[PDB]
Every structure is written in structure tokens, then in C-alpha cells.
Design a protein around this nucleic acid. Structure first.
Lengths: 80, 110, 99, 95, 99, 80, 108, 94
DNA sequence: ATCGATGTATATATCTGACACGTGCCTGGAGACTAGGGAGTAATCCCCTTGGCGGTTAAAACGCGGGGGACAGCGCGTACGTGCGTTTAAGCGGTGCTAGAGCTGTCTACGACCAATTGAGCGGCCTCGGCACCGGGATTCTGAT
DNA sequence: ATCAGAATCCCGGTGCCGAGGCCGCTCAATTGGTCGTAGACAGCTCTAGCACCGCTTAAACGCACGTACGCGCTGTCCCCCGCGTTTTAACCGCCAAGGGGATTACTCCCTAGTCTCCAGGCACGTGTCAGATATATACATCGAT
């Protein structure tokens, strides 16, 4: 069982039901997992770069909030 | 020997602390000098923006029969009002679901 | 005895506030993505970082799915296809959509 | 020992208990308000700093913050903010 | 005997680089818009600023028309309709569409 | 003759021919004039405030390029 | 006399971009309180690499047009024909520039 | 009077090194000049935010290094890091 | 089911204005030296993250059957490109005028900075209530009856 | 036309843990002088932007018309959802260990700052060639027969 297979198909359908989607194609799962992988790849790359500059070895919440702040999607609720 | 220490906020009559905003502007390297009225103006703008979001949040919480603000009400309050939404469209809200809505063609019968 | 029930599901899930994807697969996915940049050194994670990552990723995916739903509705269909989500990722641009 | 770790929480308490007497707030919403006020602060301060640098002045005075707040928030929100800022400096210059 | 002659026009305009709107309508439209925000005072204009305004506006409208044409092609149509440009403006960035 | 018709029908047709549009509905002119008008209001308000700060009365190229920079569409070739 | 002959710091780096002008702009830029010594040299190397690569793409794009003088059309064609630069310079609009010669796939 | 400093001459020299016989018009030189100022302002913004986030007061070469790694995508940044290393290894001598 | 008219691409002549190069200059970069504090590094504490184990249970997975919807195709009407003749307004030159942009010189109000003081605000701790959950009764849609 | 059943919503009752109040403290905000320079301001000089006008011509415009294409409709078949059953991994609680985050002390090197000197880059000319346009030639491409 690969590591992207932890993203289950009822969960992706739950994301679609939040989005107002009535029906879901059987082919959507691979591309949705792919877009999740590329998005998380770019964000985790940004946050781990911020960690490596500070000479720390642990991604704290501040690194995730700054890394998302530099991609144009700032998140509120975890400190400033 | 000297006069009684008054906060500068009481000179402006405002609730946001001008002294802390002045300390943040001095260590923030934005400019080499800081004018005297600029943190007062900042305190006013922040006071009004907090008053706007809290007023919409309190009405949004009273609409859900609740007397204590959870982030769900803050999200709903921000996104219903267009003028704040334009400012806050670019910001994700934690613990925040999307507005209760559905596109009109999906509702088949009335 | 079979009735359509998507309307109660959409009405129930759009008023929810908890995180909707399972937490632990998301956690090991973030760790297995993280190990590809620090050259095999095991990094630690605070819990609040993974919680913030889940919040940002889930809101972004919901925005992407509604906009691709506008695309699928536009063609007269009601089912969301992979060509619509790919086209919406192209139309959001290079900085917000691909990355 | 621990550091002071300053924040904006108590002012959200005072403005909340002034605008609404009987309404409470959770700690996660308090943190979300804290990050919100820090973010909008950084945008307004970055706007005033860039604009003061563009016209070859070196001081941030209230006029630069005035043009910055009219420039960044969209519409009549900024208009009311200009009104409150003028009323605030009207009170502040008295003493 | 005319079959199709738009192809020469599209490739000729995509290999030419000149400006597409005449300078004077853009000029008097810009002055009529500018007097509506500065409370009746008349402003002067440097020529390079007005030229830069026309370059930015024409590039932005060209990119918006490519976006709406991808929306036409996705829904099975071939002619550009106003619902397509409306949906393109909504699916674009909320900040970018209207400030 | 009203001024919004100075942006002519062949000019918008040429803009669509640059965009790859093969066939054009006749109702597109009013809506395209609408989006052009909203765009011009958005940029001109910000550039006029940038002029108003410097106590000047002429829109220069620097202020229009800064106003385009604050909307997130930077423009090259007219100064920094 | 006792004062040595002046070597520019760009000549110490073997680079063309002006190190001293960048040091003055970092001092008046006010991004940081203090300015470190090796940081404008590192930045100067980054700009030399960017200008050299973009000018190389521009020169090849000029050779395709059989011209030896660079027009903005050459920069536009050089910039969007490189995907890593397309991610870099997607958001910038280039003055006096056209669009790519891209006709959509339904050509028949 | 006014000096109006521009990077025109440095763009001309690097152009002369990479392509010997290629010229440049004034509008494309202005395009290059505003381009260099823009990439400068982005890198300075990354150095300012990272210096303020980690409670450091000075930008050293490490800050610019992680900034250029963060802002430019992919292998272009890596070769820029290579260029910076070859710059610093010759700067510290003599 | 091949050949001819013409749109389309390219070579040649012949200039102009912009371009690349030369020159004087001034101000900004460089050299040398000093002072002071930012930060590098080592040591230590504890915390909180990771790792592990056992059981639970709701969720995932899988299969099956039914029907809503995607898709290809056909006819109709409408609206759009193209061609041709008319107009009109944009552009280009040419002059002229003056508001306002830019520089220079003076001065003062305003803001940086330091030391003593004190209270506003922050960490820690405690209590009770808004809220989370469950159960019973009125309300509401479906689709058989 | 008409309601049993399931579902939904509302309301009463219970319990708990996080919010809000209280207290000690410490360092940051405030005050009071002091000193220096950015900018406000007055004034003067001059470019360039606006206004006007003639003239030409390319571009805009209106209409007629044939036809490409949007759209409603229909049939077919396919693939997705609801439901039921079996399996499994997330989850919760507990616990231990140790890597590492965080703090403090100590030290020293790097950089702000000052002063002098000189050369690189910028304003201003200037001579000359790449690109623009016109013209001639041929290739390809669509149309005719």
C-alpha cells in the first residue's frame, strides 16, 4: 500500500460534497491525489527551507505560516 | 517631583496601545524616523477594523444562538459582507468552512 | 428501498467545522514528502505545524473544487471531470495553481 | 524562566466588551484575531514604507499613513477609516 | 472564392507588436475617468505614463480573452459568449478582477 | 457621440484576434467595455492617490507603474 | 604614496555588476539594520547569472529573427519560451511586447 | 544636477561578454533596467522578512543564499547558488 | 487529376535616426582606522515529540443492482464574417502659452536618545458556566396507499 | 387525494473544561531635557504639456447576404451511487527516552562611522550602419477545368 493511498476515496468524495459536487468521476482520484502531492510538495519545500536557514531541525508552526505567506495564501490562527 | 504619567492612548482616547505600535515601528526598520501622529492614526484604523469584524461576528454569533465567538462565526461574518471579503479574499481562515451555499441549477424543484 | 441522499450530505458537511480528511495519513504523507528534501535526515514535527498545514491545504482544495465545479456546470454536465480540474488549475495561473 | 511573548489579546477583550457587553470569545478565535491584526499591520506598514521610499522622503508622518490607508483598503471602509483617523489625531494633537 | 481569411489576420496580429487601440479614445476616456476621482480638478498627463497605461491595459485584456477562450473551448462551444467572460472574471483571482 | 464607443468594434475584434478567438458574438462589446471600464477605474484611483501624496498635479510614469505594482501586475520599461 | 592603488570590489569578485552601488542601496534600502560584507557580492553573482541567461535566450531569439539588435519582441519570445523563467516571469507584463505565436489546437 | 543612475552599462558589458556583436535599443535597455530593479526588490524583501523572523539584525551571505533558494524555482536557483559560491571564494582572498 | 492566377515569402536598393562611441566632469566609491555590540559557541535543563502497545469502533472497501446522465447525431434558425462603398476622426506638422516641475537657500519644529520611575500588561492559578451531548416531543418530506 | 415512517428541528436536562477573573512582577512605556537635520516653504527659472488648426487618408461604419454554428431534441448505453457486509487502521490513553529548543554567559570580530582622494559613470555631442520601406523575383497554394 503506497503512501498516497492513505488519502481514501470517501474522503475525496467528502471534499467534493463540501464543494457542491453532485457526481464524481472515477478518474478524478489520481489527478486529485497528484494536485495534493504537488501542492504539499511546494509548501513543504518552502517550510523546510525556512527551517534550514534557522539552523533548527524541526518544522514548527511558524515555518508553515511563513511558507504559506510567501505563496500568496496567508493563514490566520497560528501566531504571527 | 514631576507630573503623573499618563498613557499616550489616553491622550488619544483610544483602546489600541499607541506605545506598543511605536515600539513595533521603531524596531521594524520601515524608516529611520517616526512621526508623532502616525501611530495614533494606526491605532484608529486598527480600532475601527476590529470594531467592524467584531460587530459582524457578534451579530453572526447571535444568529446561531451563541454567546461566545468560535472561528466559524468569524468566517461566516467575514465572507457574507462584500467589502471586507475583498480585503480578506486572499486570507484562509482556520477552522473555517465555506459559506452555506449551492449553485442554483442543482436545486431542481420549488 | 433506495432513495437519493446527497442533499442531506451536502447540507450537513457544509455546516461542519472539523477537519474532514483523516489526520494520520496526512501526517505520514507530510513526513514522506519531507524526507525527499533533507537528504534522508529524519526531521521532527510539532503538532501545530501539521494542523496548520491541514487547514491551508483543505481550504485550498475546496476553493479549487468549487471553481472546477463552475467549469463542469458551464458545459451542461453535472459531473465533475478531470479535464475541468486541470483546466481550472491552468486558469488560476502559475503561482497559485501549479505552485 | 520564560520570555514575555507579547501579543494583542487584551485589547481584543476590551474592544469586544465595549462593542458587545455580554459576548465571549474562545482562545482559538483569540489567536486568529491576533494573527489578523499583525498581518494587516504589516501590510499597512509596508505600504507606508514603500511609498515613503518612492518619493525620497525619509520620515513616516501621518500623511503617508493616510495615503496608505486610502490606498489599501477598498471602498468606503477606508473612507470611514480616514474619518476616524482624523478624529483621533484631532484629539491627540490637543495635548 | 472565399473559404477562410481570419487565419492571416490572427497570425499577422500575433507576429506584429503594434498597439491595437487608437491613442485618442484611450486618452479622452482616461481623462474622463481621472476627473471622476480627483473631485473636478483637471490633471495633466505625461505622455509616457499614458502610453504605459495603454500597454498594461491591452496586455491584460489580451490575457483575459485567452482565458475566456479556453472557457469557450471547454464547454463545447466555438464562439466567445459573455457568460464565458463573466465566469472567467469570477474564476480569476478575487483581488485581480476587482481590487 | 459618447466616449465609450471610441473603443471601436474592429479594435476589440482585433484584440480578440490576438487572443486566438475565431468567432465573436455580437453581444460581447458591451461586456468587454464593462470590464475595461472597471479595470481603468481600479488603476486610475490608485495612481491618482499616488499623485496626490507627492503634492503634484501631473500623473507621471512612476506613479502609474507603482499603482500597477500594488494590484500585482508589475510593468517593466518605464522606471523603478 | 602610502595609499594603495584602488581595486574595485567587483574586480575582486571578477564580476561586472557594481558592488559599491549595491552596498549604498542596501544601506539606504533599510531592509536590515546592518549590511553584511559578503551579501551584496552573493546577490551580485545572482544578478549576473540571471542577466547572462536571459540575454543568452534573447540572443538566440534574435538570431531566429535574423536581426542583430535586440527589440522587446526578442525579450518576450525569450522569456515565455523557458518554463522555469515562465514560472519566474509569468506575472510581469513586458512593454512593447506581443504574445506567443500560439494558435489553438483546433486548426483542421 | 540629477544623476539618474541606471544599470545600462553593466548590462552592456555582460551582453558584450556573452554575445560579442549584439546591440540593444533604448526601450529594451529600459526593460532590462527595471527588471534588475524588480528582482533586486524581491530579494531584498526576502532578506528583510527572514532577518526579522529569526531575530537577526544583519543580512549575511547565508540569508541571501536561502532567500535566492526560496524565491527562484528549481535548478536556476541551484546554479545561482553555484555562482554565489564561486563569487564568495574569490571575494575573501586578496 | 493537372495547370494557371495570385497570395505569400524572400532578395535587393537606398536611405535616416537611433545607436554606439568619444569627451569633460563631479560626486560617489574606496582606503585606513577606530569603537562597540551582534552574534557565535559552549553548557545545561527540561519538554515535548517520537516511538510503542492494547483495545475499540467507526470508517473504508468491495460488490451488486438500478437508473440518471454523458454523448453522438439531426434539423432549424439566427447571427456573424466578408465585401463594397461612404464617412470621419485620428494623426501629424506647426505654433504658442503657461502651469507646474525641479532646484536652491533658510530655518525651525520635530524627532532621536538617555536615565529614572512606575504601572500596564503578562505568567500562573482557580472557579463556574457556555457549550457539548443525549433524550423526548412537535414538525416535515417521500412516496407508497 | 392522502398519510406511516423516517428525518429534521426544537427543547429539557447534565456535565465538564476552558474562559475570565485575580495576584505578583518586570520590563517596557512614559517623562523630561538635549541636540541635530529633514523637510516645509519661499522663490525663481524653464520644459513640456495642453490647446488650436489645417490636411490627408486610413480606418470605421452600415448593409446585404450566405452560411457556420448554437441549441433543442432523441436514443443509446454506460458508469456512478445507495445499500449491505466484512475488514482494518485511526484513535485514545499511557509511558519512556532523548534530541533538541531555549536560555545564559562570554568573547571577539565585523561593521558603522569619519575623512581624504581619485576615477567611474553620466550629460552631451557625433559619426555611421541596421532596420524600415519600396521593388523585383519566385515558390506555394488554392482555384479552374
Amino acid at each position: 500500500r503506497d503512501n498516497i493511498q492513505g488519502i481514501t476515496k470517501p474522503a475525496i468524495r467528502r471534499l467534493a460534497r463540501r464543494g457542491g459536487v453532485k457526481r464524481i468521476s472515477g478518474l478524478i482520484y489520481e489527478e486529485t491525489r497528484g494536485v495534493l502531492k504537488v501542492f504539499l510538495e511546494n509548501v513543504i519545500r518552502d517550510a523546510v527551507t525556512y527551517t534550514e536557514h534557522a539552523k533548527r531541525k524541526t518544522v514548527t508552526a511558524m515555518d508553515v505560516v511563513y511558507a504559506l505567506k510567501r505563496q500568496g495564501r496567508t493563514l490566520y490562527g497560528f501566531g504571527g | 517631583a514631576r507630573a503623573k504619567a499618563k498613557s499616550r492612548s489616553s491622550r488619544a482616547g483610544l483602546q489600541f496601545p499607541v506605545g506598543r505600535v511605536h515600539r513595533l515601528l521603531r524596531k521594524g526598520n520601515y524608516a529611520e524616523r517616526v512621526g508623532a501622529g502616525a501611530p495614533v492614526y494606526m491605532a484608529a484604523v486598527l480600532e475601527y477594523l476590529t470594531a467592524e469584524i467584531l460587530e459582524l461576528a457578534g451579530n453572526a454569533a447571535r444568529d446561531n444562538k451563541k454567546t461566545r465567538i468560535i472561528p466559524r462565526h468569524l468566517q461566516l461574518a467575514i465572507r457574507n459582507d462584500e467589502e471586507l471579503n475583498k480585503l480578506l479574499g486572499k486570507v484562509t481562515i482556520a477552522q473555517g468552512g465555506v459559506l452555506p451555499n449551492i449553485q442554483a441549477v442543482l436545486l431542481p424543484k420549488k | 428501498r433506495r432513495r437519493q441522499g446527497w442533499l442531506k450530505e451536502i447540507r450537513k458537511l457544509q455546516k461542519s467545522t472539523h477537519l474532514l480528511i483523516r489526520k494520520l495519513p496526512f501526517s505520514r504523507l507530510a513526513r514522506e514528502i519531507c524526507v525527499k528534501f533533507t537528504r534522508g535526515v529524519d526531521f521532527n514535527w510539532q503538532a501545530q505545524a501539521l494542523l496548520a498545514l491541514q487547514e491551508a491545504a483543505e481550504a485550498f482544495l475546496v476553493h479549487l473544487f468549487e471553481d472546477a465545479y463552475l467549469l463542469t456546470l458551464h458545459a451542461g454536465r453535472v459531473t465533475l471531470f478531470p479535464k475541468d480540474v486541470q483546466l481550472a488549475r491552468r486558469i488560476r495561473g502559475l503561482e497559485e495553481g501549479l505552485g | 524562566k520564560r520570555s514575555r511573548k507579547e501579543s494583542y489579546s487584551v485589547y481584543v477583550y476590551k474592544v469586544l466588551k465595549q462593542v458587545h457587553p455580554d459576548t465571549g470569545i474562545s482562545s482559538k478565535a483569540m489567536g486568529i484575531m491576533n494573527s489578523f491584526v499583525n498581518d494587516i499591520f504589516e501590510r499597512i506598514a509596508g505600504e507606508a514604507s514603500r511609498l515613503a521610499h518612492y518619493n525620497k522622503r525619509s520620515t513616516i508622518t501621518s500623511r503617508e499613513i493616510q495615503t496608505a490607508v486610502r490606498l489599501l483598503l477598498p471602498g468606503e471602509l477606508a473612507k470611514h477609516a480616514v474619518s476616524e483617523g482624523t478624529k483621533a489625531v484631532t484629539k491627540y494633537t490637543s495635548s
